[PDB]
Structure formats: C-alpha cells, structure tokens
Amino acid sequence: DRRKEMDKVYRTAFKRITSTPDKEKRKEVVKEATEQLRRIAKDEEEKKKAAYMILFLKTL
C-alpha cells in the first residue's frame, strides 16, 4: 500500500515535469516530489526506491 502511494507521487510528478516548459518550475516539482517521497518511505527497501525515483526525475 505504501508503495502504491509512492508510485502515485512519482507518476504524478512525472506528468507535471514532462509537460512544464519552465526550467525553474520543474525544479520546484521534483523538490516537492522529493520531500513527499522521503516522508512516505521509512523502510530500507522503500527508501532505495525513492532514491532511484528522485534520481530519475532530476535527470529529466
């Protein structure tokens, strides 16, 4: 259940980042996505998935 909520935050951030022309605006979404993912994950395996998901958003 905690993983499906983490997939929502990631997939929702993706759509917003992938369709926002402003460079500075996208940085604010991934920053917002970063905080919500770090707060929704406390397990070791969970936090690793958030690490990759945050990494994927930033390289966009």
Residue numbers in the entry: 1 to 60
Sentences from the paper on this structure:
The design of proteins that bind to a specific site on the surface of a target protein using no information other than the three-dimensional structure of the target remains a challenge. Here we describe a general solution to this problem that starts with a broad exploration of the vast space of possible binding modes to a selected region of a protein surface, and then intensifies the search in the vicinity of the most promising binding modes. We demonstrate the broad applicability of this approach through the de novo design of binding proteins to 12 diverse protein targets with different shapes and surface properties. Biophysical characterization shows that the binders, which are all smaller than 65 amino acids, are hyperstable and, following experimental optimization, bind their targets with nanomolar to picomolar affinities.
Unlike antibodies, the designed proteins are soluble when expressed in E. coli at high levels and are thermostable, and hence could form the basis for a next generation of lower cost protein therapeutics.
